[PDB]
Structure formats: structure tokens, C-alpha cells
Design an enzyme around this catalytic site. Structure first.
Site, short mmCIF file in Angstrom:
data_model
loop_
_atom_site.label_atom_id
_atom_site.label_comp_id
_atom_site.label_asym_id
_atom_site.label_seq_id
_atom_site.Cartn_x
_atom_site.Cartn_y
_atom_site.Cartn_z
N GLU A 51 48.87 39.77 46.41
CA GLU A 51 47.71 40.06 45.56
C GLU A 51 46.88 41.20 46.17
O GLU A 51 46.62 41.22 47.37
CB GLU A 51 46.86 38.80 45.38
CG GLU A 51 45.56 39.00 44.60
CD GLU A 51 44.74 37.72 44.49
OE1 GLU A 51 45.11 36.72 45.14
OE2 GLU A 51 43.72 37.71 43.77
N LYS A 124 45.27 37.87 36.03
CA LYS A 124 44.88 36.60 36.63
C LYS A 124 44.17 35.72 35.60
O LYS A 124 43.30 36.19 34.86
CB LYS A 124 43.99 36.84 37.85
CG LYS A 124 43.82 35.63 38.79
CD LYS A 124 43.11 36.03 40.09
CE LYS A 124 43.02 34.87 41.08
NZ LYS A 124 42.40 35.26 42.39
N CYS A 175 47.52 33.65 42.95
CA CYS A 175 46.63 32.89 43.84
C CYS A 175 45.97 31.68 43.15
O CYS A 175 46.63 30.67 42.89
CB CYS A 175 45.56 33.82 44.42
SG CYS A 175 44.61 33.17 45.86
#
Length: 429
Positions: A51, A124, A175
């Protein structure tokens, strides 16, 4: 019907710092060069970056991140991924800060095919606290799926060589996506991994910037000038004792190219979270990561859940996304109705159980690939590294001791580097 697959997977682990973009790109090419010249090197079918791979992570204000955001098909991250994919004839995925045409900002991961073209861009879906500093946007589409065409990577059972093509069903999770929504949703929701089981995903890719437990995550301790200065002391001592600068290691590369050494199965305790032994993985976080993919894991009590029908309400009541998510703001969407039961409903799961089977993943295969960064930022935040490749075999505890998951290999918690694994599994066509 059955189709055996052989896939060569390369993961890159970096320690990017804010304002060092050109230095990070140079160290990348340095790592890739050492991979080619390895004793047991093989041309990868796919390469995964972490990321915000090239930019660093901890931006404090919108004005701080603006000098580094780009378009999905423009900028240093795209050009790097393009150069890499064309040189190896492979897929390349890399995390980067994105800006669109309406000047809105996203935390993203772009995909480039073996021909040098950008075929996908994931944003995301579950945001982290740090993202709020620069007003990051949630993915309007929620979790997403996409296909990946691999050449000459498959074969029938009786065949001797992999001379067949195969299109795999893939999905990217960045994440926080693996965590409960806003750290407020129920833990047993398992949003991301449930989505992957529901949609029959075969290949899971996760760029990450996941923290080691010794990081300072306390609102009271981070805003008080007296508490924070005292809190950093522990972290500063931890890295000095490892013979490293506060920012962590850079330019010393750990390579695991072609070896078949697998990561030992170990439970978590009060020693596995310590920031020591930079060449070895953080097994606390490795166990935790596996736990967040619970629906793919074998669990005995499912047969009782199925026989007692104690999850039917949950399965039927579950929505595609959390109700307060960006998904429903602009989306929009029962035993009592007159509508029939669509195929979609019969694919739904909760805690790994569907309406027709106690364990929907039973008898299937899937590959998981985690690319996590290493190093440190702000003297408060320690990233856990430990990038790795995993296999869910779907055969008959809640950690790495569970033998329905195979730990094919991991990098250490504190070093930059790369790991290549030739992964064998099967799909049904």
C-alpha cells in the site's frame, strides 16, 4: 471439469518514506535485478507491491499529500508498473495515492496486464484513521471482482505439462478492508473474506501498510505533549537495540527466490509481537491475518450451525455493504415476499456457512497474497512487514495451526526484499 494450475508469484516488500520517491524507485529496480540473477529464478506470472508503495504513508494534511497524488493511468507508479510488466510479461499491482477529474482523493491499487496496459483500478473500501487527515474517499463500488488471464499455466489431471490457459477470478483488498468497518462493526462479520467466498474468488491480492503491536495507537497519548514524548522512548529504544536508524531498514535486501522453505506453524503469545529478529515474520500478525479469513478455514462447529439452522436469519438479513457506507449514498437495495430465490442468495454465506452447505468453501482451493510494507514513520508507528503467500486447500484452532491453510512462505518483519513461490492448486471449469 477439474483444472490443475501452476502459478509463479513474486512479492515485493519496501520501506518508502515521504519525499524520497526517486530513491524508492531506484531501490526497487535494484531488488528486481538481484531477483533475475538468483540461482533458482523463474519468470513470475504476477508481481505485487504494498500500500502506497512509492510515496510513504503517514500524511497529516491534504496539502501534504497533494504533491504526490496522480491519475490512475499517469505518474511514477503507473510508469513503474508498466515498465515491470512489459519486461517480465506479467501482471503488476501497486498501491498509490489517486486523484480523479473532480479533484477527489482515493487510496488505490492499479493493475497492469502483460501487454503494458492498465486493466483495473481498485479503491480502498474501509478507510483508516490516517486517511481522514487528507479527506480520503471511500470506494463507491464497495468490494470488487475482476478476471485475470494467464497463459499456459494449466493442465488436465492425466496431462504431463501445463500447456493450457486459465482465467482466474481475482479480488483486491487494501489493508483496513480486512478489518471490521470503522472498528465498530461486529468482529464475526468478516466483511472482505465473506465477500470473497460469496463470489467464489480464486486469487486474493492484498497490498498493505499494517502495524506492529508496539505502535502508539492512543488518542490520549498522542495529543498530550508530555505523554507522547515519553511514549516514543520505547520505540526509539526498540530500533536502536536492533542497530537501525529510527526510520527502519532500507537498502539491505532479504531474498527468497524459488526456495520451498515454508513458514513454521506457531501460536501467538506475549513474545511474538516484539519488534525483534528483522529477518523473521511477526507471527502475531500472521495469525491475526489468517483469522480474518475465517470463512476459508475448516471449523468443526459448522455442522451444528447447519443442522440447527441458527444462521439462516443472518445469511438472509446480511446486506452487501454497511448501511452508512459510500455504497448506498447516491445504491439501492425475504421469506415473506412473492419474489423467488435467486442464485445470488444461495451463494450467500455467514461465518462460512451457506443455506445449502455447512461449509461452502469445503473442497475448493484459493490463493492469498499479502504485500505489506516495513519500516517506521513519525517515531510512533512501526509497520509489521512479513509479506507472504498462503493456500487454502479446503480439506477436513483459529490460527496457523489450522491445516486447511498452507503457509507457503514469508519475509521478515523489518527488511526490504522479495519472495517468489511457485504455487500449485486446482479450479473447476
Amino acid at each position: 471439469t477439474k483444472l490443475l494450475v501452476s502459478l509463479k508469484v513474486l512479492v515485493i516488500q519496501l520501506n518508502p518514506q515521504i519525499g524520497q520517491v526517486d530513491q524508492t524507485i531506484k531501490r526497487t529496480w535494484s531488488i528486481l535485478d538481484k531477483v533475475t540473477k538468483s540461482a533458482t529464478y523463474v519468470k513470475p506470472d504476477i508481481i505485487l507491491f504494498p500500500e502506497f508503495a512509492l510515496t510513504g504513508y503517514s500524511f497529516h494534511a491534504r496539502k501534504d499529500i497533494l504533491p504526490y497524488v496522480t491519475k490512475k493511468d499517469e505518474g511514477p507508479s503507473f510508469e513503474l508498473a508498466k515498465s515491470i510488466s512489459e519486461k517480465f510479461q506479467c501482471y503488476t499491482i501497486i498501491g498509490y495515492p489517486e486523484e480523479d477529474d473532480e479533484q477527489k482523493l482515493y487510496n488505490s491499487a492499479l493493475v497492469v496486464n502483460p501487454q503494458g496496459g492498465q486493466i483495473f483500478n481498485y479503491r480502498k473500501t474501509f478507510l483508516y484513521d490516517t486517511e481522514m487527515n487528507w479527506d480520503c474517499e471511500e470506494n463507491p463500488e464497495g468490494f470488487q471482482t475482476f478476471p485475470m488471464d494467464f497463459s499456459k499455466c494449466a493442465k488436465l489431471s492425466n496431462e504431463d505439462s501445463y500447456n493450457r490457459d486459465v482465467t482466474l477470478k481475482a479480488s483486491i483488498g487494501i489493508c483496513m478492508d480486512l478489518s471490521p468497518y470503522k472498528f465498530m462493526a461486529p468482529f464475526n462479520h468478516f466483511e472482505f473474506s465473506s465477500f470473497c467466498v460469496d463470489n467464489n474468488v480464486e486469487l486474493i491480492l492484498c497490498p498493505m501498510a499494517w502495524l506492529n503491536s508496539t505502535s502508539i495507537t492512543d488518542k490520549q497519548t498522542l495529543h498530550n505533549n508530555s505523554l507522547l514524548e515519553a511514549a516514543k522512548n520505547k520505540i526509539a529504544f526498540a530500533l536502536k537495540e536492533q542497530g537501525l536508524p529510527l526510520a527502519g531498514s532500507q537498502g539491505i535486501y532479504q531474498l527468497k527466490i524459488g526456495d520451498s522453505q515454508r513458514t513454521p506453524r506457531v501460536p501467538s503469545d506475549d513474545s511474538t509481537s516484539e519488534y525483534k529478529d528483522m529477518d523473521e515474520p511477526d507471527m502475531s500478525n500472521v495469525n491475526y491475518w489468517i483469522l480474518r479469513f475465517f470463512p476459508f478455514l475448516y471449523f468443526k462447529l459448522r455442522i451444528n450451525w447447519f443442522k440447527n439452522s441458527s444462521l439462516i436469519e443472518s445469511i438472509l438479513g446480511k446486506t452487501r455493504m454497511p448501511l452508512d457506507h459510500e455504497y448506498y449514498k447516491d445504491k439501492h437495495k425475504l421469506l415473506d415476499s412473492e419474489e423467488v430465490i435467486k442464485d445470488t442468495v444461495l451463494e450467500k454465506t455467514f461465518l462460512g456457512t451457506s443455506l445449502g452447505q455447512p461449509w461452502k468453501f469445503q473442497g475448493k482451493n484459493a490463493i492469498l497474497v499479502l504485500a505489506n510494507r516495513c519500516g517506521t514513520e513519525d517515531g510512533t508507528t512501526i509497520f509489521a512487514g512479513s509479506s507472504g503467500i498462503y493456500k487454502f486447500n479446503g480439506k477436513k484452532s483459529l490460527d496457523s495451526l489450522n491445516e486447511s491453510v498452507e503457509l507457503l512462505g514469508n519475509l521478515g518483519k523489518g527488511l526490504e526484499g522479495a519472495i517468489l513461490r511457485e504455487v500449485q492448486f486446482e479450479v473447476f471449469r
